[PDB]
Write a protein that holds these residues in place. Structure first.
Motif, PDB file in Angstrom:
ATOM      1  N   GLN A   1       0.846  -1.183   0.000  1.00  0.00           N
ATOM      2  CA  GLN A   1       0.000   0.000   0.000  1.00  0.00           C
ATOM      3  C   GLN A   1       0.879   1.229   0.000  1.00  0.00           C
ATOM      4  O   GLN A   1       0.400   2.352  -0.129  1.00  0.00           O
ATOM      5  CB  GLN A   1      -0.878   0.003   1.242  1.00  0.00           C
ATOM      6  N   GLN A   2       2.177   1.011   0.177  1.00  0.00           N
ATOM      7  CA  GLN A   2       3.146   2.098   0.201  1.00  0.00           C
ATOM      8  C   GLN A   2       3.718   2.325  -1.181  1.00  0.00           C
ATOM      9  O   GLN A   2       3.955   3.458  -1.599  1.00  0.00           O
ATOM     10  CB  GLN A   2       4.297   1.765   1.144  1.00  0.00           C
ATOM     11  N   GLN A   3       3.968   1.224  -1.877  1.00  0.00           N
ATOM     12  CA  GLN A   3       4.524   1.308  -3.210  1.00  0.00           C
ATOM     13  C   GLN A   3       3.493   1.871  -4.179  1.00  0.00           C
ATOM     14  O   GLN A   3       3.828   2.208  -5.312  1.00  0.00           O
ATOM     15  CB  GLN A   3       4.987  -0.068  -3.673  1.00  0.00           C
ATOM     16  N   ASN A   4       2.240   1.972  -3.741  1.00  0.00           N
ATOM     17  CA  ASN A   4       1.185   2.519  -4.589  1.00  0.00           C
ATOM     18  C   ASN A   4       1.212   4.024  -4.404  1.00  0.00           C
ATOM     19  O   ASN A   4       1.063   4.789  -5.354  1.00  0.00           O
ATOM     20  CB  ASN A   4      -0.187   1.972  -4.178  1.00  0.00           C
ATOM     21  N   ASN A   5       1.415   4.436  -3.161  1.00  0.00           N
ATOM     22  CA  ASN A   5       1.478   5.844  -2.811  1.00  0.00           C
ATOM     23  C   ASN A   5       2.733   6.460  -3.423  1.00  0.00           C
ATOM     24  O   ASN A   5       2.687   7.561  -3.971  1.00  0.00           O
ATOM     25  CB  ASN A   5       1.521   6.010  -1.289  1.00  0.00           C
TER      26      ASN A   5
ATOM     27  N   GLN B   1      12.216   1.626   0.910  1.00  0.00           N
ATOM     28  CA  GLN B   1      11.054   2.457   0.681  1.00  0.00           C
ATOM     29  C   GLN B   1      11.165   3.753   1.471  1.00  0.00           C
ATOM     30  O   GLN B   1      10.382   4.676   1.260  1.00  0.00           O
ATOM     31  CB  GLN B   1       9.786   1.707   1.072  1.00  0.00           C
ATOM     32  N   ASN B   2      12.131   3.826   2.384  1.00  0.00           N
ATOM     33  CA  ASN B   2      12.330   5.035   3.178  1.00  0.00           C
ATOM     34  C   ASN B   2      13.232   5.946   2.367  1.00  0.00           C
ATOM     35  O   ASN B   2      13.036   7.157   2.312  1.00  0.00           O
ATOM     36  CB  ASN B   2      12.997   4.706   4.518  1.00  0.00           C
TER      37      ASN B   2
ATOM     38  N   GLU C   1       0.961  11.015   3.998  1.00  0.00           N
ATOM     39  CA  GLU C   1       0.322   9.733   4.278  1.00  0.00           C
ATOM     40  C   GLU C   1       1.307   8.574   4.167  1.00  0.00           C
ATOM     41  O   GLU C   1       1.084   7.502   4.726  1.00  0.00           O
ATOM     42  CB  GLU C   1      -0.858   9.515   3.328  1.00  0.00           C
ATOM     43  N   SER C   2       2.396   8.794   3.442  1.00  0.00           N
ATOM     44  CA  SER C   2       3.417   7.769   3.275  1.00  0.00           C
ATOM     45  C   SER C   2       4.361   7.794   4.479  1.00  0.00           C
ATOM     46  O   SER C   2       4.821   6.752   4.944  1.00  0.00           O
ATOM     47  CB  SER C   2       4.200   8.013   1.981  1.00  0.00           C
ATOM     48  N   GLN C   3       4.645   8.994   4.977  1.00  0.00           N
ATOM     49  CA  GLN C   3       5.515   9.157   6.136  1.00  0.00           C
ATOM     50  C   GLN C   3       4.797   8.525   7.318  1.00  0.00           C
ATOM     51  O   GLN C   3       5.401   7.839   8.141  1.00  0.00           O
ATOM     52  CB  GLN C   3       5.746  10.643   6.426  1.00  0.00           C
ATOM     53  N   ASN C   4       3.493   8.769   7.375  1.00  0.00           N
ATOM     54  CA  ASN C   4       2.635   8.266   8.435  1.00  0.00           C
ATOM     55  C   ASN C   4       2.797   6.781   8.722  1.00  0.00           C
ATOM     56  O   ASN C   4       3.670   6.383   9.493  1.00  0.00           O
ATOM     57  CB  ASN C   4       1.171   8.557   8.099  1.00  0.00           C
ATOM     58  N   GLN C   5       1.956   5.961   8.100  1.00  0.00           N
ATOM     59  CA  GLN C   5       1.997   4.526   8.335  1.00  0.00           C
ATOM     60  C   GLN C   5       3.115   3.757   7.646  1.00  0.00           C
ATOM     61  O   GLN C   5       2.870   2.757   6.974  1.00  0.00           O
ATOM     62  CB  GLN C   5       0.648   3.894   7.987  1.00  0.00           C
ATOM     63  N   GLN C   6       4.342   4.238   7.812  1.00  0.00           N
ATOM     64  CA  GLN C   6       5.511   3.564   7.262  1.00  0.00           C
ATOM     65  C   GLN C   6       6.204   3.024   8.508  1.00  0.00           C
ATOM     66  O   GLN C   6       7.034   2.117   8.441  1.00  0.00           O
ATOM     67  CB  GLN C   6       6.431   4.551   6.530  1.00  0.00           C
ATOM     68  N   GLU C   7       5.822   3.597   9.648  1.00  0.00           N
ATOM     69  CA  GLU C   7       6.357   3.224  10.953  1.00  0.00           C
ATOM     70  C   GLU C   7       5.709   1.932  11.447  1.00  0.00           C
ATOM     71  O   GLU C   7       6.241   1.258  12.329  1.00  0.00           O
ATOM     72  CB  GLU C   7       6.100   4.347  11.966  1.00  0.00           C
ATOM     73  N   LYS C   8       4.556   1.598  10.876  1.00  0.00           N
ATOM     74  CA  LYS C   8       3.836   0.386  11.253  1.00  0.00           C
ATOM     75  C   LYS C   8       3.722  -0.545  10.053  1.00  0.00           C
ATOM     76  O   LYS C   8       4.474  -1.540  10.012  1.00  0.00           O
ATOM     77  CB  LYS C   8       2.438   0.738  11.774  1.00  0.00           C
TER      78      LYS C   8
END
Lengths: 68, 68, 68
Positions: free
Chosen positions: A5-9, B7-8, B61-68
């Protein structure tokens, strides 16, 4: 999902950045135009077109098999 | 981790590219300004603002739930 | 692989976008030049250089350990 869901963003962000990139090139083009030139920028245009084509291809292939 | 530490970096690179993008738009703006215009570029500005807003939202929104 | 073959494409797209970014900056630079200026844009250049350096570093470290 999750990491997916990250690689989509990340892809959506790249696609939008490309729209910003094409907007600035148009702005530059109208600036060169109204001041003569635009004849010696032929090579510059070629490189821009080529790189835009490479990106569009990269984005399309990424949109493709992201569903699987 | 591993694939996640990538991805970071990819996100950090996008965030920095955006800073380069906003720098070139400012440069273009000062160029249109000192040569009259800036009145017919109202629609151009609108599109730039809209796309910058979409990206900022995508990055947040990517910075957000990248921690989880 | 699978999710990894995507992070390669996303990286390739970023690398190409950077080439488009450096092309537009060159275009802007030649535009400021032929109209006087280029003396008050010293700080602008500094920021561009710094951000280009940060990105190149980000791209290099991503190309690196993507193989492992």
């Amino acid at each position: 999902s999750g990491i997916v869901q990250q690689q989509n963003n990340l892809l959506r962000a790249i696609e939008a950045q490309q729209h910003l990139l094409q907007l600035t090139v148009r702005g530059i083009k109208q600036l060169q135009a109204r001041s003569g030139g635009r004849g010696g920028w032929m090579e510059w245009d070629r490189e821009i077109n080529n790189y835009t084509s490479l990106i569009h291809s990269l984005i399309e292939e990424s949109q493709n098999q992201q569903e699987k």
